[PDB]
Every structure is written in C-alpha cells, then in structure tokens.
Amino acid sequence: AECSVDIQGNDQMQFNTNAITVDKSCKQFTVNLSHPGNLPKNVMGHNWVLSTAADMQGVVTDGMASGLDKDYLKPDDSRVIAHTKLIGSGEKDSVTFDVSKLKEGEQYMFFCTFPGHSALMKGTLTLK
Amino acid sequence: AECSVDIQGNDQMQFNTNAITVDKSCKQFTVNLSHPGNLPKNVMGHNWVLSTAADMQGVVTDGMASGLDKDYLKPDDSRVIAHTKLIGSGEKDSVTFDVSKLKEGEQYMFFCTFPGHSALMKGTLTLK
Ligand SMILES: [Cu+2]
Ligand SMILES: [Cu+2]
Ligand SMILES: [Cu+2]
Ligand SMILES: [Cu+2]
C-alpha cells in the first residue's frame, strides 16, 4: 500500500480519518495535511502529531501550555515521533519520517494539539 | 557513485558544493542537509531546492514573497522537483526523490530560497 497518506483537518474539528496503517516495507512514510474550510489557524489551526499511545496525554497538555507561537507543542518534547506544523484553512504541510522509528506491537496515536482538539481529532497509527 | 550526497549550509551563506551529479542507475537519490555554525533559521536558514535551470528565478522570487512561515517557498509550486525544509544551525533534514524525475540533457539547479541567499548558495545537478 502507498507510503503516504493525505489527511484533511476541517473547520468542524475533524480529521478525515481515525486510523492510519503504515506499510512495514516502506523505507519512509509521509503525511500530507490540508485544511478545507475558512477558519484561520489562530482559531482553528490543525497539526498532525505522532507519539506512542501512552505519551499522547502529556504531549497534548504540555503542548497546550506552550502557546500558539509554538504550534501548541512543547519545544524539544522527546515524546514526539513525527509532526507537521499548525495549519489554517486553505493551507498545507507535509512530514516524512523513517519507518524504522516504529515497532511491531507498540501502539501509536496521531493527534492535533490545538487546545481542545485532541478530543475529536485523534486516531491510531499501526505498523503492518 | 553513491545514491546520496551530504550538503552543508553554513553561517557564511555557502553550500559546501556547487555541483552535484546524480547516478543514472540509482532508483532514488537522497540529499542530507546540515547547518554548521550558530545562526538560527529566521536569520540564516538554509534549504535545498531543485528545479530546472529555467524555473529557478520564478521559484526564488515567489519563494521570497511567501514568508518565513512557509520556508520561503510558494505553496504547491509546480516548478519544484524536490526540496528539504528551511534549516537553522545545528539542525538537519533529508529529502529523497525518484531518479526518474530527471531527464538526460535537461539542466537542473539546486538552491536556497531564503531571501538573498540564491545569489551565492546555488549549483547544478546533472544526471550522469
Ligand atoms: Cu505498499
Ligand atoms: Cu486541530
Ligand atoms: Cu554509483
Ligand atoms: Cu540559505
């Protein structure tokens, strides 16, 4: 299956998907984020962030406290495996990461860290 | 010859090379950019961008006008064949692209689109 996935974060606080699967044979994997709608990022900014399932909460709460100027992400957060930047409607961003960062059996989660968004905009990433 | 090259963009506005040659037999090619020095990206950020020689100017000027928040690159610029992100000193990024995107005889150029950098930080990429 393709070594990349196109994700949309819309004005209704939704990702167009809640489960991503990464093909074990890909040397790399790329996420392409877009923002259909009209709301600017200071009001409806969306990012795509990846961590183990266990680290999600801490990344989300430290991220909230970091501010908009930081893309609601804690600088040098060691729990973040890969991330795009905070995007506003009509904008785009992509992130590529080595498939060797993921492990079999481990449970990953992708999510948005804009305040209050993680509750709806979140999902699983599994290596298969 | 190797299917990858390590490039350095330093605080003096220089690439450690002005000519790259891509081995026709490689299925893919990877550029590894680094930034020796101390200047942050908002002051001395460097990226590695590839286009035909004819498209370089337009990519550079539209890039400038896009801003720092966009890595001084026009969103969805169709003229861009491959690119890394804008990097600051002590940082790193890599880009891999299919060697099949390049054509024999065509003339490519790699360059930095941080304002005013393309004048010094530029070079040729040829498929051989
Ligand atoms: Cu596949
Ligand atoms: Cu969001
Ligand atoms: Cu070779
Ligand atoms: Cu530069």
Q: Helical H runs in chain A? A: 41-44, 56-66
State which residues form the domain around A21: 1-128
Q: Residues of B at the A interface (Cβ-Cβ below 8 Å)?
A: 75-76, 96
φ and ψ of B38, to 5 deg: -130, -10
Distance CA B110, CA A30 (A): 23
Closest chain B CA to residue A96: B95
Q: What is the CA radius of gyration of chain A?
A: 14
Residue A14's region, left for phi above 0, alpha for psi from -120 to 50, else beta, is beta
Q: Which of A27, A28, A92 sits opposite B75 (nearest CB)?
A: A92
CA of B25 to the centre of ligand 4 (A): 30
**Closest by Cα among B44, B52, B57 to B13:** B44
**Closest by Cα among B20, B18, B38 to B29:** B20
> Structure tokens of B27?
């299925």
- Specify the number of domains making up chain B: 1
Contacting residues for B33 by C-beta, under 8 A, at least 6 apart: B7, B8, B9, B46, B47, B48, B84, B87, B92, B93, B94, B95
- Beta strands A92-98 and B4-8, pairing class: unpaired
Element (H, E) at B65: helix B56-66
Closest chain A CA to residue B70: A93
Chain A interface, best mutation among B70, B83, B92, by max A CB count within 10 A: B70
Q: Is B64 annotated as a binding residue?
A: no
- Cite the beta strand spans of A25-127 per DSSP E: 28-34, 49-52, 82-83, 92-98, 108-111, 122-127
Distance CA B56, CA B125 (A): 12
Closest chain B CA to residue A71: B69
Distances B105 to A51, A119, B52, B127 between C-alpha atoms, Å? 45, 53, 11, 8
Residue with tokens 């993680």: A118
The DSSP symbol for A101 reads: G
Q: Which residues of chain A lie closer than 8 angstroms to B96, CB-CB?
A: 27-28
CA dihedral B1, B5, B10, B12 (to 10 degrees): 50
Closest Cα of chain B to A102: distance in Å? 19
Q: Which residues of chain B lie closer than 8 angstroms to A35, CB-CB?
A: none
Distances A38 to A44, A47, A67, A69, B77 between C-alpha atoms, Å? 9, 16, 22, 20, 22
Distance CA B51, CA B33 (A): 17
Q: Which residues of chain A lie closer than 8 angstroms to B75, CB-CB?
A: 91-92
Distance CA B79, CA B50 (A): 9
CATH label of the domain that carries residue A119: 2.60.40.420
The DSSP symbol for B9 reads: B
In single-letter form, the type of residue at position B103 comes to K
- CA A33 to mean position of chain CA atoms: 9
Burial of B29 (0-12, 13-18, 19+ CB in 10 A): buried
For residue B82, list its beta bridge partners: B50
Cβ distance of A28 and B75 shorter than 8 Å: no
**Closest by Cα among A57, A37, A32, A69 to A111:** A57
